[PDB]
């Protein structure tokens, strides 16, 4: 369950999540667009899911893609600020999951975000240990999908 998944994020994982977010979160426009573009480059099959965003090849130039990327970063910001209270983390994760469930995104597909996140972290000198801490947070959301 979502609680089980969340309830496991240990004090060390919370620390790595926060430390890394201090950096990749300080520049939401840049990193967020980086996440999306990388996701499209490595998993072309997901481009169709974003038809409403227009031409995603435009990158930073596409306002729809830019506004979406910035907003996505605030969803993560929200998850990070609720790390100390499982109760709050869970209920916010639940609301969030609804959007991707109606979007027909399965747990396995949503998991594809791991690759990109890993690459954005690396570009900032945050190795495997950190990528793993993020896969745990991503796992909490997967438990609600």
Where along the sequence are the contacts to a copy of itself (CB under 8 A)?
A: 28-29, 52, 63-64, 66-68, 70-71, 74-75, 77-78, 81-82, 87-88, 90-96, 98
State the minimum distance, in angstroms, from the CB of residue 75 to ligand HEM: 4
Query: Is 68 one of the annotated binding-site residues?
Result: no
Q: Choose the contact partner of 41 out of ligand HEM, a copy of itself, none; CB within 5 to 8 A by kind.
A: none
User: Do 31 and 20 contact (CB within 8 A), yes or no?
Assistant: no
Q: 3-state DSSP call for residue 95?
A: helix
State the minimum distance, in angstroms, from the CB of residue 133 to ligand HEM: 13
Quote the strand ranges of 5-144, DSSP E: none
97 touches ligand HEM (CB under 6 A): no
State the minimum distance, in angstroms, from the CB of residue 73 to a copy of itself: 9
109 touches ligand HEM (CB under 6 A): yes
User: What b/e sequence results for 44-54 when a residue is b if at least 16 CB atoms lie within 10 Å of its CB, and e otherwise?
Assistant: eeeeebeeebe
CA dihedral defined by 49, 113, 84, 12, rounded to 10 degrees? 180
């Amino acid at each position: 369950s979502v609680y089980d998944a969340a309830a496991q994020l240990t004090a060390d994982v919370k620390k790595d999540l926060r430390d890394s977010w201090k950096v990749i979160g300080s520049d939401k426009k840049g990193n967020g667009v980086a996440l999306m573009t990388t996701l499209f480059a490595d998993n072309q099959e997901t481009i169709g899911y974003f038809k409403r965003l227009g031409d995603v090849s435009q990158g930073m130039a596409n306002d729809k893609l830019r506004g979406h990327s910035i907003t996505l970063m605030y969803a993560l910001q929200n998850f990070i600020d609720q790390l100390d209270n499982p109760d709050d983390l869970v209920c916010v994760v639940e609301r969030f999951a609804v959007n991707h469930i109606t979007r027909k995104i399965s747990a396995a597909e949503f998991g594809k975000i791991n690759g990109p996140i890993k690459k954005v972290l690396a570009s900032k000198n945050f190795g495997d240990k950190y990528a793993n801490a993020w896969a745990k947070l991503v796992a909490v959301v997967q438990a609600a999908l």
